[PDB]
Short mmCIF file of C-alpha atoms in Angstrom, two decimals:
data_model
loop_
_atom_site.label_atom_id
_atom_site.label_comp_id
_atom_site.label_asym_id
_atom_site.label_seq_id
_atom_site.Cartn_x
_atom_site.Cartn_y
_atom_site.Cartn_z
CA UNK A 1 87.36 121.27 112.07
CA UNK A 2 87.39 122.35 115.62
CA UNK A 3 90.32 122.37 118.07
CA UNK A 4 90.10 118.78 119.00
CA UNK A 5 89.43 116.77 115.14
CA UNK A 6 92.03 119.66 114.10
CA UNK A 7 94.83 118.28 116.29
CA UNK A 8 94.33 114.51 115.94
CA UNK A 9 93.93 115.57 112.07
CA UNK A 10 97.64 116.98 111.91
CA UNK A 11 99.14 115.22 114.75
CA UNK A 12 97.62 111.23 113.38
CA UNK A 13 99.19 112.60 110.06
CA UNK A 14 102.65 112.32 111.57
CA UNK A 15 101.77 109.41 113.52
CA UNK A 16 100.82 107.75 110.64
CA UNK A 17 103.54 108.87 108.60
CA UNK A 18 106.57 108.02 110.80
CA UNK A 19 105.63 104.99 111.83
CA UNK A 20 102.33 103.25 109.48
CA UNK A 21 99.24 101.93 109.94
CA UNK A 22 100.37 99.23 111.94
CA UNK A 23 102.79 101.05 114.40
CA UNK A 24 100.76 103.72 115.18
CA UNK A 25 98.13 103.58 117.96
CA UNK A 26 95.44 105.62 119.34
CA UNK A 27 97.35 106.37 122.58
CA UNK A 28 100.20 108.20 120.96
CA UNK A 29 98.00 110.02 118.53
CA UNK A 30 96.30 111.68 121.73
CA UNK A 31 99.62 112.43 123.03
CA UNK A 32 100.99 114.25 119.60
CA UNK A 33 97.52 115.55 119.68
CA UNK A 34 97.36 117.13 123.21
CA UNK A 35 93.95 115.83 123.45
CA UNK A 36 92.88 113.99 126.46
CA UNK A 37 92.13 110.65 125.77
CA UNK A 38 88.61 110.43 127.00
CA UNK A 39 87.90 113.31 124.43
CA UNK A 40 89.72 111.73 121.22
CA UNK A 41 87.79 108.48 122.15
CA UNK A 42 83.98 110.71 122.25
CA UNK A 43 85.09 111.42 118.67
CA UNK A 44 86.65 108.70 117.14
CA UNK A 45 86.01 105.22 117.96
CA UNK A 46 89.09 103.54 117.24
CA UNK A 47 92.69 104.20 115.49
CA UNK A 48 90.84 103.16 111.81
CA UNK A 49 88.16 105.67 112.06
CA UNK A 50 90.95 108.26 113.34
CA UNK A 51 92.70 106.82 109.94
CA UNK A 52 89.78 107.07 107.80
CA UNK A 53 89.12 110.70 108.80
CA UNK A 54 92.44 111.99 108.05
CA UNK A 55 92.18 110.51 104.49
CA UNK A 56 88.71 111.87 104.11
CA UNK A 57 89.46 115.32 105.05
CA UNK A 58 92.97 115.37 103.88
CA UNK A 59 91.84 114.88 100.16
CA UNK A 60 89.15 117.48 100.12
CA UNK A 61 91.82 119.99 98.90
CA UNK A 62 92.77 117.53 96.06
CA UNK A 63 89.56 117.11 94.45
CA UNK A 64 88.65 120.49 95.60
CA UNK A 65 92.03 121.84 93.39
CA UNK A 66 91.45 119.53 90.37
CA UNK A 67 88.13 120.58 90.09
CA UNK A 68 88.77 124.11 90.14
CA UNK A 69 90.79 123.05 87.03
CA UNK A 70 88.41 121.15 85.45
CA UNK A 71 86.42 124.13 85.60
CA UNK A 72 88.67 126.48 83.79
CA UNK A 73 87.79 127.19 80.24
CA UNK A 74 91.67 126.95 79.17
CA UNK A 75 92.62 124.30 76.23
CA UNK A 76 92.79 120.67 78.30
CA UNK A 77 96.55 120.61 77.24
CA UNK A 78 97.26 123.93 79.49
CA UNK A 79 94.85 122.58 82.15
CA UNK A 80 97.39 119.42 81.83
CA UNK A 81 100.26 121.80 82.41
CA UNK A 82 98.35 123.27 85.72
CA UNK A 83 97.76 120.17 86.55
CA UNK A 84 101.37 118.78 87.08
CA UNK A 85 101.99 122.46 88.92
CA UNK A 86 98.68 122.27 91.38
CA UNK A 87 100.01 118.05 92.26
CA UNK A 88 103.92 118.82 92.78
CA UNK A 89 102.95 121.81 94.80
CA UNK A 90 100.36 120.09 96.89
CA UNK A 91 102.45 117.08 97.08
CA UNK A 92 105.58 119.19 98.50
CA UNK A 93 103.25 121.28 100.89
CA UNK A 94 101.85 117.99 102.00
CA UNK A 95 104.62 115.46 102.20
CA UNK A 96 103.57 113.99 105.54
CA UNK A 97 100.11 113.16 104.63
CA UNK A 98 101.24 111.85 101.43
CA UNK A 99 103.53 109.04 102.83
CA UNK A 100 100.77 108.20 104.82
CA UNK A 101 98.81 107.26 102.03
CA UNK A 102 101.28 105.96 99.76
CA UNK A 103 102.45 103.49 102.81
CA UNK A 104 98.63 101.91 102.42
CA UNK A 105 98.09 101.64 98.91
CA UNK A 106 99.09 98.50 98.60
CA UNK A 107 97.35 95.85 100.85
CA UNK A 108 94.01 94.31 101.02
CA UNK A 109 92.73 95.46 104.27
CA UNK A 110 89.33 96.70 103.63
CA UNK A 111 90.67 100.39 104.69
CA UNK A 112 93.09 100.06 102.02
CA UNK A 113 90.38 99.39 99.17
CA UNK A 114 88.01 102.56 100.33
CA UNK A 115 91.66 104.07 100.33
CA UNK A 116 92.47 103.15 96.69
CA UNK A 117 88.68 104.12 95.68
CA UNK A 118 89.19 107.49 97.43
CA UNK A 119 92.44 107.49 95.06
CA UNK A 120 90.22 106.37 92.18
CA UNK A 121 87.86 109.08 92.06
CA UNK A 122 90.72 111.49 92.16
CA UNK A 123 92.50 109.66 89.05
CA UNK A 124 89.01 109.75 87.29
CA UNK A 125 89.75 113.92 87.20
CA UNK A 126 92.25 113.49 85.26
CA UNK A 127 90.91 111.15 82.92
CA UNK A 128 88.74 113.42 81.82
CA UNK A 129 90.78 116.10 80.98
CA UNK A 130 92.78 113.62 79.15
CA UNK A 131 89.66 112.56 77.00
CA UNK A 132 89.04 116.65 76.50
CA UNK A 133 92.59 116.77 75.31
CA UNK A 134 92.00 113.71 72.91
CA UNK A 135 89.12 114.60 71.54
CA UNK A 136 90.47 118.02 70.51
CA UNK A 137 93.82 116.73 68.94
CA UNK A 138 96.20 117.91 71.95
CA UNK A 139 97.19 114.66 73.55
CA UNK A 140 97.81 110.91 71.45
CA UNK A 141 95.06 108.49 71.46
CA UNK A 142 95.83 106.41 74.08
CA UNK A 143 95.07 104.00 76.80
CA UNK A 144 93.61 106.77 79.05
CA UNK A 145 93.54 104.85 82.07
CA UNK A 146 97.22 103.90 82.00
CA UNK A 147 98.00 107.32 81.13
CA UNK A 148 96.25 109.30 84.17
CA UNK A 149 97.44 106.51 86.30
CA UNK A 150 100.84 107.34 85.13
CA UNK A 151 100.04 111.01 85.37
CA UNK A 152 99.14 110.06 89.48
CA UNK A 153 102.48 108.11 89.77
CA UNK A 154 104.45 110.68 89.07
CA UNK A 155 103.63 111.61 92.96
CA UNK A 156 104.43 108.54 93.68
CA UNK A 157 107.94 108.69 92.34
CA UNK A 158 108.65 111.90 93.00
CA UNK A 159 108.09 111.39 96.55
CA UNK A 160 110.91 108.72 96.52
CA UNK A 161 112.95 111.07 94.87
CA UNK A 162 112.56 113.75 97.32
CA UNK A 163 113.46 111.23 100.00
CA UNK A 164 116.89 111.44 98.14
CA UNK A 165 119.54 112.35 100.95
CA UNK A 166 122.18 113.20 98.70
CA UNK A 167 120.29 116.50 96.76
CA UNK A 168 118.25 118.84 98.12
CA UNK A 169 114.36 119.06 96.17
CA UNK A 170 113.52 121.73 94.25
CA UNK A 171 110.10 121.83 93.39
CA UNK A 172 109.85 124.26 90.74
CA UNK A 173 112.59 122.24 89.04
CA UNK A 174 110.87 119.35 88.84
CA UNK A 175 107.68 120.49 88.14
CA UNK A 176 109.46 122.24 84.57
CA UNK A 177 111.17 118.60 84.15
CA UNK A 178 108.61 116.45 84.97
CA UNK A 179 105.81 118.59 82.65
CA UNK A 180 108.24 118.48 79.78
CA UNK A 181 109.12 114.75 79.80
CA UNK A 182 105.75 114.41 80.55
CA UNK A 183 104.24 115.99 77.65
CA UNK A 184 107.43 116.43 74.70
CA UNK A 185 108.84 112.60 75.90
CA UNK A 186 112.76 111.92 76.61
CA UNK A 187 113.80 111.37 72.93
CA UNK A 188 115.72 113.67 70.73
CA UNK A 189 113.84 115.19 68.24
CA UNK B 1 113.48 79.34 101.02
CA UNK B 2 110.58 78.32 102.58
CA UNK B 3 111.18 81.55 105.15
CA UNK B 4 111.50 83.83 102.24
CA UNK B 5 108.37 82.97 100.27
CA UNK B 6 106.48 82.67 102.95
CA UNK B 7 107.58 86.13 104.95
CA UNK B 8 106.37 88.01 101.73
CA UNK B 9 102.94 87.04 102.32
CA UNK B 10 103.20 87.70 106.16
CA UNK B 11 104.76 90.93 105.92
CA UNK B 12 102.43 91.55 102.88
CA UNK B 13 99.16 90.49 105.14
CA UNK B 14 100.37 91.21 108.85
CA UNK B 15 102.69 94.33 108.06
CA UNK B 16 106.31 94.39 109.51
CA UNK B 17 104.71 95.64 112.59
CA UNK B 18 102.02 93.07 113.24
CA UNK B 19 103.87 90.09 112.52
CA UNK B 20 106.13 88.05 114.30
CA UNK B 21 108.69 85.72 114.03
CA UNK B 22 106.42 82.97 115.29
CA UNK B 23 104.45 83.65 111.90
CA UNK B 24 106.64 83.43 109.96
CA UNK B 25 108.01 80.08 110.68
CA UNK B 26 104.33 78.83 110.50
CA UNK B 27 103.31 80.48 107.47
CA UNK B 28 106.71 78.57 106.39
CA UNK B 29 105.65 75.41 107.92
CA UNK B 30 109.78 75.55 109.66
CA UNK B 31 110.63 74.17 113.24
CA UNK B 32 111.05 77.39 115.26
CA UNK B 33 114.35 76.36 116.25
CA UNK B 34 115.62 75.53 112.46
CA UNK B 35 114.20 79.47 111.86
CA UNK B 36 116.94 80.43 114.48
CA UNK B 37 119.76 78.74 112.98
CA UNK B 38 119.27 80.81 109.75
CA UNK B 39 117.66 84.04 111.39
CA UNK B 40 118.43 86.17 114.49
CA UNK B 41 115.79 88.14 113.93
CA UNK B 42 112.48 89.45 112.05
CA UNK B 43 114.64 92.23 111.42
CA UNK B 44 117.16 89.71 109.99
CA UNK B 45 114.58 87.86 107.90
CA UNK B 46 113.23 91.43 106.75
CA UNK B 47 116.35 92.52 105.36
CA UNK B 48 117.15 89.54 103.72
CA UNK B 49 113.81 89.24 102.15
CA UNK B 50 114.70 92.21 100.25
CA UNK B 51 117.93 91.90 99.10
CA UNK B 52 117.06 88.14 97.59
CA UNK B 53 114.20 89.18 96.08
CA UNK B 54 115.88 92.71 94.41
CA UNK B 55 118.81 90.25 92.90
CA UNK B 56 116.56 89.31 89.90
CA UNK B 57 116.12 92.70 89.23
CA UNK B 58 120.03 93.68 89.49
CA UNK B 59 121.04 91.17 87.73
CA UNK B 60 118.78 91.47 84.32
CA UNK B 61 119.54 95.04 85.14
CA UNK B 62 123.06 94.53 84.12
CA UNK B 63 122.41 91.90 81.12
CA UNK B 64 120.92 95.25 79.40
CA UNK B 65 123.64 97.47 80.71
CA UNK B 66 126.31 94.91 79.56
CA UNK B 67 124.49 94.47 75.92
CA UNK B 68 126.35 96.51 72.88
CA UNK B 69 123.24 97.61 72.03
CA UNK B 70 122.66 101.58 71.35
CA UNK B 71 121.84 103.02 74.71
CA UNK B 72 118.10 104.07 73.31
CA UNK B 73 117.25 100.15 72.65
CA UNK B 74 118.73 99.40 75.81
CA UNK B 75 116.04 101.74 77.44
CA UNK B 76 113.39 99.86 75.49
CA UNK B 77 114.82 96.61 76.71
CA UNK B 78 114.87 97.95 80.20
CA UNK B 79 110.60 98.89 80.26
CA UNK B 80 110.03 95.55 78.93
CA UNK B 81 112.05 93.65 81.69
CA UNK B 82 110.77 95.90 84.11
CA UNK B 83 107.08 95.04 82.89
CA UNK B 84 107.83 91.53 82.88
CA UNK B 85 109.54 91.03 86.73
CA UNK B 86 106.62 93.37 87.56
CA UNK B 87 104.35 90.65 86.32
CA UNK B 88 105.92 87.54 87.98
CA UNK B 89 106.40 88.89 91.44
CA UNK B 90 103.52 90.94 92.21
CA UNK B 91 103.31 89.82 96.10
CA UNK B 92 106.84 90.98 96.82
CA UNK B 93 106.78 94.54 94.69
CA UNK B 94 103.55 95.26 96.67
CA UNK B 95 105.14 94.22 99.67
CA UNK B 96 108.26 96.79 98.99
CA UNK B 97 106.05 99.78 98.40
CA UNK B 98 104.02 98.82 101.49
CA UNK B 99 107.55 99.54 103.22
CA UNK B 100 109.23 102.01 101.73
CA UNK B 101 107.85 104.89 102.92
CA UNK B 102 107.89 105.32 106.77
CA UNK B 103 111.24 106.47 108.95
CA UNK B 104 112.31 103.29 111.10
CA UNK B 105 115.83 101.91 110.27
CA UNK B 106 114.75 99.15 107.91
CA UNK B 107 112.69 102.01 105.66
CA UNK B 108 115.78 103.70 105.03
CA UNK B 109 117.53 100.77 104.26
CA UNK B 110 114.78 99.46 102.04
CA UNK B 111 114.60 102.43 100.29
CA UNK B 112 118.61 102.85 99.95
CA UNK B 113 118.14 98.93 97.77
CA UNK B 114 115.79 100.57 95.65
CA UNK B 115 118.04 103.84 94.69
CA UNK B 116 120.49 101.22 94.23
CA UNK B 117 118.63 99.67 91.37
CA UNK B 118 117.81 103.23 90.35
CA UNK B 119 121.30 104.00 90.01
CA UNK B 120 121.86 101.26 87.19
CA UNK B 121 118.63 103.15 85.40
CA UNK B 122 120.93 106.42 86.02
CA UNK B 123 123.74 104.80 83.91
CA UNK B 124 121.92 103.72 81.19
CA UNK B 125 120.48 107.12 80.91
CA UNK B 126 123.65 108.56 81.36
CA UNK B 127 125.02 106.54 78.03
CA UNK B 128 121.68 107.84 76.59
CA UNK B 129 122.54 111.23 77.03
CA UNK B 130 125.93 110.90 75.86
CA UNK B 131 125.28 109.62 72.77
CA UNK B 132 122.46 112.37 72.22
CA UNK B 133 119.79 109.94 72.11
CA UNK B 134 118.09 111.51 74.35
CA UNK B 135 117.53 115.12 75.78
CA UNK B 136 119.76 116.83 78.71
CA UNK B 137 117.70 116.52 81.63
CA UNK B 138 117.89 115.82 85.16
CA UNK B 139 119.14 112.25 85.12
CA UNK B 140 118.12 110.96 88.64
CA UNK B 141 114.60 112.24 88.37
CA UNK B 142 113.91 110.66 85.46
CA UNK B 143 115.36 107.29 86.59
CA UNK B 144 112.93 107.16 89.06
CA UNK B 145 110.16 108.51 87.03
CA UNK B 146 111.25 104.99 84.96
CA UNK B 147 111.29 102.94 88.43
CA UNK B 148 107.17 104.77 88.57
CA UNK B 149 105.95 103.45 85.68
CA UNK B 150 105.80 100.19 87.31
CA UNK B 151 104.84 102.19 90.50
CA UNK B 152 101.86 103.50 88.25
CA UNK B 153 100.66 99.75 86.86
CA UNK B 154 101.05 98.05 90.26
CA UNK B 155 98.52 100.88 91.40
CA UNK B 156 96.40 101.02 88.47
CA UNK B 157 96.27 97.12 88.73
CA UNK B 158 95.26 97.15 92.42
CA UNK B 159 92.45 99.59 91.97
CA UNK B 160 90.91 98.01 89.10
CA UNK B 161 91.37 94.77 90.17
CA UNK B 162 93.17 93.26 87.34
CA UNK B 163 96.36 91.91 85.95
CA UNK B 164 97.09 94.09 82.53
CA UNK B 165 98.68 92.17 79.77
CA UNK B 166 102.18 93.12 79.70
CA UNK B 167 103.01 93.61 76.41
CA UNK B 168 99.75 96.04 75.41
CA UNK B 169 101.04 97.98 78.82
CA UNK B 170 105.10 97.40 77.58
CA UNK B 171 103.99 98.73 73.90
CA UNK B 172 101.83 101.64 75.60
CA UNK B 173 104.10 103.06 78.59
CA UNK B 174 107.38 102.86 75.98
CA UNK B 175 105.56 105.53 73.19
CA UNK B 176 104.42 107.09 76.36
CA UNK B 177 108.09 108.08 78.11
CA UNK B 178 110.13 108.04 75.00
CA UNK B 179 107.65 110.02 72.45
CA UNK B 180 105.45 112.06 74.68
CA UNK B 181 101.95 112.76 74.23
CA UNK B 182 101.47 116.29 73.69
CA UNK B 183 100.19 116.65 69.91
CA UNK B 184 101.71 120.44 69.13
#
């Protein structure tokens, strides 16, 4: 990215993130961008193509990260365990851009469907370590959909959580809590 | 009534932002002026959208915490209610996490409802751990790590385009949080 898609990239992140889809316009991201107007509008035709962009670039690193972890030649169940350390760390390194997805998720805009797809192909990742980790006896047999959806969510929930202003996030912490309820389950045993 | 079913779908379809009062009392089919003699405000509508439609979920909420049952079948009883309100008012749950994430006034105040509700989760848990039903563990986190798995299914729903039946995802999600899946 050069100077200019660079600075729309971070600055429409914020943009985005304080105040959604909706609320956020062109002119401010130029602003926040320091990048004359005439110049933001030769490279992106409108505020959705600024949006789709952002999510296009910003996920790179995802995929880029889980595949790196796909590729390892660990047992699936300790690529699982690198797996909730790579999200929660890229989550808490990220939080902006994060919001900024999570605040379209959930409507039926056509953005937000190439959104959720973008979201998809990242989920399917992790289905297939979890069908690795089935077939060699280190994960239940299970519903593996639901469970790497649920494996996703986590994000979701820990982002609320972090929003918490009462405690202060720690994300080493959570990432030891989350892996073991995660993988040992909340019951006594 | 008419304002509050109807401003789900608007703030569902036009955003917060996007929408106006105007809309709303359409959508509704209401008299403008009979909007104003209930509502100030789309702020005012906004607000009370939320804290109508999160009294279902307090108040089943409680019927578990109030039960004598052992804290552990409470938590059952809890992912299957969950699952169920999940199920019969998808508009307005994707309409909350369409809010709750930005910084204006209303977000925080959304989002302070939902720790509420989280909070009940947090005492059930708390009774949980008491009893030494379930491990020691950071209690908060894993309330709303409860509050995701519907999080999760609304998502997984939306992307697949489908509506799950509740009980396979109920019978699932429950072996899932209270079992684990690691096979060691």
């Amino acid at each position: 990215m050069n100077r200019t898609k660079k600075a729309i990239f971070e600055a429409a992140i914020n943009v985005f993130a304080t105040s959604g889809y909706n609320g956020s316009t062109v002119d401010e991201i130029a602003s926040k961008a320091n990048v004359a107007k005439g110049t933001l509008y030769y490279n992106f035709k409108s505020k959705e193509e600024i949006f789709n962009f952002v999510i296009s670039k910003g996920l790179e690193i995802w995929h880029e990260k889980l595949t790196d972890i796909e590729n390892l030649e660990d047992e699936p169940i300790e690529k699982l365990k690198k797996l909730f350390k790579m999200q929660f760390e890229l989550l808490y390194e990220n939080r902006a851009f994060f919001k900024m997805v999570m605040s379209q998720l959930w409507g039926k805009e056509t953005r937000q469907d190439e959104l959720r797809n973008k979201i998809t192909e990242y989920i399917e990742g992790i289905e297939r370590i979890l069908k690795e980790a089935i077939s060699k006896k280190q994960i239940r047999e299970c519903d593996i959909s639901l469970l790497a959806h649920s494996l996703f969510g986590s994000l979701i929930s820990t982002s609320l959580y972090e929003l918490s202003r009462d405690k202060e996030f720690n994300v080493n912490k959570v990432i030891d809590e989350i892996t073991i309820n995660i993988l040992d389950g909340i019951v006594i045993k």
